[PDB]
A paper describes a structure:
Next, we imaged single particles of the trimeric SARS-CoV-2 spike ectodomain in the presence of excess biliverdin using cryo-EM. Because biliverdin binding conceals a deep hydrophobic cleft on the NTD, we suspected that it may mask or modify the antigenic properties of the viral spike.
The recognition of the betacoronavirus SARS-CoV-2 host receptor, the cellular membrane protein angiotensin-converting enzyme 2 (ACE2), maps to the S1 C-terminal domain (referred to as the receptor binding domain, RBD), while the function of the N-terminal domain (NTD) remains enigmatic. Here we show that the NTD of SARS-CoV-2 spike binds biliverdin with high affinity.
Author numbering:
A (entry chain B): 713 to 828, 848 to 1146
B (entry chain C): 614 to 617, 633 to 676, 689 to 761
C (entry chain C): 960 to 1146
C-alpha cells in the first residue's frame, strides 16, 4: 500500500518546569513571639537548621530548572520587519508589538487559563513566598529569540553561528530528512501553507474553548496550596495540652507546670513541620525530572530535527515551536502524516537478461499491466531504467522475481 | 518584606526592589550578566573607588539575521573544539549501628530500646 | 557531622551523658530519663536515614545518565543535538575522576561564512532540474551547485541533478543552462 496525499498536523504538549519557592521559620511558627518556648526549643540540637536548609536547597534548585530549560541561546535574535516566509503565517505566535507585555496571542490564552485573605494568614505565621529570579518578561524574550532563530536560520543557530536561509528551502531540507524528495514540496507549496495556517487556527480555538488541557499544569499549584493550608491548619491542635494557643498557657500557668504543656505543643508542631519538609523534598524530585525532560525536548525537537519515534509528536517530525505558560512550557509540534493510500502489487527484483535488477532507493509497483519504480513514502511512478537500478547475480536465487524489460536510456541516442 | 519606615537604621544609597529593600548598593543603568542573584530580575556584583552595584541583568547581545527570500549563507572554514563534561556516578558507603549509637556500651538502655519492635532493623 | 552533634543534646533530660545518668540515679527514676534520650536519638537517626534515601535517587539518576552517555557518545556517533557537546558530534573520550566520570567531546563547528544568492530549481528546456544532494548558489554571474555544510563549487551537469515536471509551478525558478557531459565525447 502506497500513500498518495499528505497532511500537516500541529499538536500541543504541556510540561511543568518549576514550582513556587517557600521558606518557613521555626522561631515564628512553633513559638511565635514567646521566649520561654524558645528556651525549651533550644534543647533540640539542630532540628531547625536542617529544616531551613532543605527548603533553601529546593528554592535554589527551582531557579536552576528554568535556567536549564529556556536559557539555551547566547544571542537574542530578532525577526526581520518584512514578513515574507513563502506563504506561512506566523503572526499567531510571534510577539505582539502593541501590548505592554510583549507576549504572543497564544501565550495570553495560556496565561488566562491558569488561576494562580488566604495568603495573609499564611504569611502571618512566618511563611513567605520568594520571588523567582526570571520574570515573565524575560522568559517571553527567551522564547521569542528561540522562535525567531528557527524560522530564519534553521538548525544552524543551535550549533554555532546562525546562517540565514529562505524558509521554503529549509522546509524541503526537512522533507529530505523523512524520506520524501524535494520536488514534492516545491510543487505543492501553496497547499502546504494553506494547511499549516489552518492547523494553527485550530490550536487557539482549542485553548480558548471549554477544555481542560492545562490541568496537568494546575495540579502542581493545587498540591502546593493544599500542603500550605494543611500546615497552617495544624496550628489549631491540642496535641494533648490543655489549650492550643501558647499565650493563654503562659498567661494562666506558672513556669513549672507550663513547661510540660509547652513541650507537648513543641513536639507536635515539630512533627507537623518535619512531615511538610519531607513531602516537599519528595515532590522536588518529580519537578526536577520533568524539567530535565522539557530541557531535552527543547534541545532536540526545537533546535533540530528528531528521528526518534513518538518523541516530538505523533507522525514524522518536521519542526517545533516553544511557548511559555505560567510555571511551565508548551510545545507546538508540526508533523507529516500520509492521508490517502492505494493498493499495488509488488516484486523484490526484475530479471531482464539473466540479470536481477534491484531498486537503488525505492520500490517496484504495478497498476496491473506495467511496472514502475516509486519512492516509499509517496506515490510518484517512474520508468525503470539502468541509471535507476543496480545488478547483482542472476535471477535464480530470488524468491519472487518476475519477467520485465529495462529501458537502458542510452541506445536511442547513439543511433 | 520591607517597604522603603520599618528599617531600624538606614544610610546612603537606599535602593528599592521588587524583592525588598536594599541598603549598601548603588543603582546603575548598565546591564551585565548575573553575578550574585538578588532576585526578580535584579543582580548584584562587586566592581570599580571599589563598590557593590545592583542592576537589571541582561540576557545577551542582540542581533538580526540578514534574512532575505533569495539569500543564503555558506561556510568555508571549520574548527575542531574539545569540551569537558563532569558527571557524578556514586557516593560514599556508610553504615551505622543503633546499639553503639543510641545506647553505647550500656546494658539497661538496650532493654528499654527493645520495646520498639523493628525500628533499627 | 550533624548526626554526631545530636549526641550532645539534652532532649529534656537532666544530662546528655548516659553514663552520667546511670551513675547517679536508681532504675525507677533513671528509666524515664533514658527513654527521653532514646526517643530523641531515634528521631535524630531516622532523619538522617530519610535524607540519605532521598539523595540516593539523585545519585542513581546521574549514574544512569552517565551510563547512557558512555553507551551512545563514546561507543558510537550520536546525532542527537546538544547531547554529546555543542556542535556536530564526532567522537568522545572517557576519563575517571574520584567518584565520577569526565567526558571529552570533540565537535565540528563552521567558522567563516559568506553570502550567496540561491534558487530552488533551474529551468533548462522547459524542464526543471533539482539538486540531487546540495544547493544552488551564485557568485553574481554564474550558477554552481555545492554541498550544504561546506563551500565547494561545482559545474551543473545532468549526472548531478534530476528532473521533475516543467518550470511553471515552481515559485523562484530561473533561467540557466546544464552541461549534459556527454555531447562533446560523441563528436
Ligand atoms: C490532497 O488533499 C488536499 C486537501 O486534503 C486536496 O485539496 C482539496 O481539493 C478540493 C477539490 O479539489 C478542494 O475543495 C479543497 O479545498 C482542497 N483542499 C485544500 C486544503 O485546499 C487535494 O486535491 C488532494 N490531492 C489529490 C491528488 O487527491
Ligand atoms: C495572518 O494571520 C493574521 C491573524 O489572523 C491575519 O490578520 C487578520 O486579517 C484579517 C483580514 O483578512 C482581519 O480581519 C483580522 O482582524 C486579522 N487578525 C489579526 C489578529 O490581525 C493576516 O491577514 C494573516 N495573513 C498575513 C499575510 O498576515
Ligand atoms: C497503467 O499505466 C499505464 C501507463 O500510464 C497505462 O497505459 C496508458 O494508458 C493510457 C490510457 O488509455 C493510454 O493513452 C496510453 O497510451 C497507455 N500507455 C502505454 C504505454 O500503453 C495503463 O492504461 C494503466 N492501466 C490501468 C489499469 O490503469
Ligand atoms: C523470464 O523469461 C525467461 C525467458 O524469456 C524464462 O525462461 C524460460 O522459462 C520457461 C517457462 O518457465 C522455461 O520453460 C524455459 O526453460 C526457460 N528458459 C529458456 C527459455 O531459456 C523465465 O522463466 C522467466 N522468468 C520467470 C517466469 O520468472
Ligand atoms: C511604601 O510606603 C509609602 C508611604 O506610606 C507609600 O507611599 C504612599 O502611597 C499612597 C498610596 O496611594 C499615597 O496615598 C501616599 O501619598 C504615598 N505617600 C508617600 C510619602 O509616598 C508607598 O506606596 C508604599 N509602597 C508600596 C509598594 O505600596
Ligand atoms: C582556515 O582556518 C585555518 C586556521 O583557522 C587557516 O590556517 C591558518 O593560516 C594562517 C595564514 O594562512 C596561519 O598563520 C595559521 O597558522 C593557520 N592556522 C593553523 C592552525 O595552522 C586557513 O588558512 C583557513 N583557510 C582559509 C581558506 O581561509
Ligand atoms: C564567478 O566565478 C566565475 C568562475 O570562476 C568567474 O569567471 C572567471 O573569472 C576569472 C577571473 O578573471 C577568469 O580568468 C575566468 O576565465 C572566468 N571564467 C569564466 C567561465 O568566465 C567570475 O569572475 C566570478 N565572479 C566574481 C564576481 O567573482
Ligand atoms: C527562461 O527562458 C525562456 C525563453 O528562453 C522564457 O520564456 C519566455 O519568456 C519571455 C519573457 O518572460 C516571454 O515573453 C515568452 O513568452 C516566454 N516564452 C517563449 C519565448 O517561448 C522564460 O520566461 C525564462 N524563465 C524565467 C524568466 O523565469
Ligand atoms: C486493498 O485491498 C483490500 C482487500 O480487498 C481492501 O480491503 C482494501 O480496501 C484495499 N485498499 C483500499 C485503499 O481500498
Ligand atoms: C505468494 O503466495 C502464493 C500462494 O497464495 C504463491 O503461489 C506465490 O508463489 C507466493 N509468492 C511469493 C513471492 O511469495
Ligand atoms: C539612568 O537613566 C535615567 C534616564 O536615562 C536617568 O534619569 C538616571 O539619572 C540614570 N541613572 C543615574 C544613576 O544617573
Ligand atoms: C551578508 O549580507 C548582510 C546584509 O548586508 C550583511 O549584514 C552580512 O555581513 C553579510 N555577510 C557577511 C558574512 O558579511
Ligand atoms: C523575493 O522578494 C522580492 C521582493 O523584495 C520579489 O520581487 C521576488 O519575486 C521574491 N522572490 C522569491 C523567490 O520569493
Amino acid at each position: 500500500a502506497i500513500p498518495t496525499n499528505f497532511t500537516i498536523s500541529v499538536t500541543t504538549e504541556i510540561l511543568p518546569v518549576s514550582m513556587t519557592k517557600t521558606s518557613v521559620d521555626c522561631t515564628m511558627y512553633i513559638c511565635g513571639d514567646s521566649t520561654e518556648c524558645s528556651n525549651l526549643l533550644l534543647q533540640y540540637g539542630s532540628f531547625c537548621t536542617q529544616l531551613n536548609r532543605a527548603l533553601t536547597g529546593i528554592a535554589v534548585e527551582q531557579d536552576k530548572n528554568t535556567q536549564e530549560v529556556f536559557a539555551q541561546v547566547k544571542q537574542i535574535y530578532k525577526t526581520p520587519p518584512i514578513k515574507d516566509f513563502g506563504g506561512f503565517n506566523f503572526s499567531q505566535i510571534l510577539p505582539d508589538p502593541s501590548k505592554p507585555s510583549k507576549r504572543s496571542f497564544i501565550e495570553d490564552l495560556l496565561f488566562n487559563k491558569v488561576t494562580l485573605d488566604l495568603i495573609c494568614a499564611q504569611k502571618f505565621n512566618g511563611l513567605t513566598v520568594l520571588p523567582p529570579l526570571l520574570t515573565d518578561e524575560m522568559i517571553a524574550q527567551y522564547t521569542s529569540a528561540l522562535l525567531a532563530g528557527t524560522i530564519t536560520s534553521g538548525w544552524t543557530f543551535g550549533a554555532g553561528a546562525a546562517l540565514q536561509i529562505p524558509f521554503a528551502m529549509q522546509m524541503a531540507y526537512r522533507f529530505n530528512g523523512i524520506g520524501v524528495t524535494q520536488n514534492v514540496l516545491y510543487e505543492n507549496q501553496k497547499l502546504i501553507a494553506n494547511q499549516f495556517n489552518s492547523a494553527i487556527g485550530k490550536i487557539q480555538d482549542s485553548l480558548s474553548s471549554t477544555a481542560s488541557a492545562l490541568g496537568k499544569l494546575q495540579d502542581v499549584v493545587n498540591q502546593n496550596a493544599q500542603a500550605l493550608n494543611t500546615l497552617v491548619k495544624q496550628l489549631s491542635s491540642n496535641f494533648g495540652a490543655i489549650s492550643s494557643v501558647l499565650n493563654d498557657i503562659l498567661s494562666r500557668l506558672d513556669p513549672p507546670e507550663a513547661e510540660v504543656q509547652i513541650d507537648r505543643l513543641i513536639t507536635g508542631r515539630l512533627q507537623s513541620l518535619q512531615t511538610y519538609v519531607t513531602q516537599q523534598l519528595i515532590r522536588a524530585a518529580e519537578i526536577r525530572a520533568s524539567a530535565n525532560l522539557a530541557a531535552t525536548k527543547m534541545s532536540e525537537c526545537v533546535l533540530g530535527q528528531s528521528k526518534r519515534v513518538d518523541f516530538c509528536g505523533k507522525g514524522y517530525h518536521l519542526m517545533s515551536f516553544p511557548q511559555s505558560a505560567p510555571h511551565g512550557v508548551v510545545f507546538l509540534h508540526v508533523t507529516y502524516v500520509p492521508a490517502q493510500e492505494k493498493n499495488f502489487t509488488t516484486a523484490p527484483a526484475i530479471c531482464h537478461d539473466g540479470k536481477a535488477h534491484f531498486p537503488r532507493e525505492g520500490v517496484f509497483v504495478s497498476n496491473g499491466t506495467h511496472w514502475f519504480v516509486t519512492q516509499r513514502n509517496f506515490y510518484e511512478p517512474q520508468i525503470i531504467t539502468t541509471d535507476n537500478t543496480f545488478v547483482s547475480g542472476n535471477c535464480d536465487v530470488v524468491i519472487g522475481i518476475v519477467n520485465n524489460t529495462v529501458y537502458d536510456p542510452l541506445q536511442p541516442e547513439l543511433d | 518584606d520591607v517597604n522603603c519606615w520599618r528599617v531600624y537604621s538606614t544610610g546612603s544609597n537606599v535602593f528599592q526592589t521588587r524583592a525588598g529593600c536594599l541598603i549598601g548598593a548603588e543603582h546603575v543603568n548598565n546591564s551585565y550578566e548575573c553575578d550574585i542573584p538578588i532576585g526578580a530580575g535584579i543582580c548584584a556584583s562587586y566592581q570599580t573607588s571599589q563598590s557593590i552595584i545592583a542592576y537589571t541583568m541582561s540576557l545577551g547581545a542582540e542581533n538580526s539575521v540578514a534574512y532575505s527570500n533569495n539569500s543564503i549563507a555558506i561556510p568555508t572554514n571549520f574548527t575542531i573544539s574539545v569540551t569537558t563534561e563532569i558527571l557524578p556516578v556514586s557516593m560514599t558507603k556508610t553504615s551505622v549501628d543503633c546499639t553503639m549509637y543510641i545506647c553505647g556500651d550500656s546494658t539497661e538502655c538496650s532493654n528499654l530500646l527493645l520495646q520498639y519492635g523493628s525500628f533499627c532493623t
